[PDB]
Symmetry: C6
Subunit: 119 residues, 6 copies
Amino acid sequence: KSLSFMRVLEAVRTMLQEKGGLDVSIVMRNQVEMPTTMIEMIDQEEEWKEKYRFAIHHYTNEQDLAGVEMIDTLIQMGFILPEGYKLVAVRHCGKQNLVKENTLIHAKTSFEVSICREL
Amino acid sequence: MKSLSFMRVLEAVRTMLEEKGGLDVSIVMRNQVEMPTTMIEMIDQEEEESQTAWKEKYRFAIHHYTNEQDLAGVEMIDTLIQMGFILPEGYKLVAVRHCGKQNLVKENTLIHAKTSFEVSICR
Amino acid sequence: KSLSFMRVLEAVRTMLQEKGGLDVSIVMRNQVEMPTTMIEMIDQEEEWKEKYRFAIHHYTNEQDLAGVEMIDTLIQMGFILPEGYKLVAVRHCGKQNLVKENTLIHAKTSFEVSICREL
Amino acid sequence: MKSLSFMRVLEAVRTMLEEKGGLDVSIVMRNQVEMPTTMIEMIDQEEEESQTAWKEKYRFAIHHYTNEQDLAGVEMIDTLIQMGFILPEGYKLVAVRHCGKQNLVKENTLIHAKTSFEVSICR
Amino acid sequence: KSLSFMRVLEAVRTMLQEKGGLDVSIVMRNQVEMPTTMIEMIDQEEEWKEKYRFAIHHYTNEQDLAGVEMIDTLIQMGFILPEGYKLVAVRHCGKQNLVKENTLIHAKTSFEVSICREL
Amino acid sequence: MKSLSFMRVLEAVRTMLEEKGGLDVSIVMRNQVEMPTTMIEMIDQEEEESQTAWKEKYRFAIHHYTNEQDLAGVEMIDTLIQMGFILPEGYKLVAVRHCGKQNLVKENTLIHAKTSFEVSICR
């Protein structure tokens, strides 16, 4: 079977939290007022091989190159998946933004991951 | 050897989730949701290349609205759909794929989960 | 020459009416309040061979699998065209929807038809 | 051997429908219509591959607004356009095709018919 | 190096003004009330060879085939560029419109130009 | 051999325009501008095919708002960016291209100039 996107979201959140000590939410929200990091799942395509695309949203009061890049690097190093599923590649793909929304610096980083399952 | 209508496919999936899953799912997409619910949204349908037969792809999405995060419920639905559903004699479900938009977003006071599928059916 | 889309609309309506006893309108309308069936022409492409794409909109107070599928089946069986033009194929193509609009169940079914003319 | 301007093509078509059809047609698209009228809407223009010459595709649409269904009138226009229209010396109308959006829709109190063409012109 | 789109805009304006005696603005404006001719740059792609796409907007109180076509012809004949850059081709490409906006006849003509530089 | 984050690329460009150009440029895109300013808007990032290495394309746009036409300033920025910018050890700037939307438009009381680039970076 193919892993639910939500399972993938959870694995990234757990990695960010356990490996980076970061507090990341897996639910996308439109209106944001205080600093926060959310993961936004975008789409999925089965190519035993699959691609998931999601973006990391990092809101901060000031430009946070260090934090954004910690996250970027953490994700690129990988994350554990449930038995039978293996992360095979991580790459940047799609929209990368840095914009001022409300009073906050909003950084959006888009990833594509390739995941293999047992056949 | 007539091409199956989308609604027949809607029904096949709804019936399976009810019978095999005990879940109540609507096959009518609603644009204004203000309470938890599970809906199937049909999207499109296309012929697929078939050497030896007639193959067709149907795309639809499952919309799962809940008061809060519900990974257990989302995965239940997701896994049942991938396990397949019975079709009328002459039609063979060839493959069930995640394909297209996958979302987890807050809407007012609901968590909105959206899972997109593409199924291949042969005749 | 190539048949006007409207001529094709008329031939489908006549088929639905004469072969299915259904009352179908060939004019697309946005706001719909009472049960009805309309044909919506979408586009046309000349490939002596041509493709027309149109959708059938079936509004009912309750889910109407029987009615929707009668129509679906009627259309798939074909319809007569003016002399010199022959329907060669009918297939599902594009958006297929089932949505609740106003108080009505709105079913949209999209078709592509291939039509040949004398050369 | 200069590429023909869209307006020249607009004029060629308008002139034909008037001269051969006795129809009054505008070459100016209007976004706010509240009475019956026939308009040509120019859309786009592209080079086409030509081995031996210079070929170009022009796309435009005929907008036919009437108080009610008018298949006779729509077909009159449609048939004249497919029969061709004369162009300046050096340019040969190679083909007239239905291509793109074809619509029949109600707008307020008018029936709006839209027919899309692609013409190939060679030089 | 590659020529800035603005440099290309300026060269077309100078050509229209010096070769055609026309008064053309290189700044696109949304709301237009009096007759005018503006150039609207759209996009650019490097293929030593490059393509620029821009549209000419010609607003007049009455249909102006003569004026529109003078411009069309002027542009097709070419325009001079700064040393090291040569216009190699001009062709129609993209949206060509004739619409009534406000009280004015708005003509939009889209061009693609190929420009070569020294290597 | 880790893929470079967009922000690192933003910084590389900003730093160059400041150090080599004496220009003050923001790397934060603002949706509501009411005074002259120069901003870099990051757009997207994609892998590029590499035979022998790892190549990646980054796209961004320079937004130059001024009280009036400023060809001198637009060209200054444009030329510096094409001259390149230094990157961290291991990454080689392979090419700087104009690519995508290029605009010169009036917005309220400002002239808004938009220049779109694609850069290829290798590792």
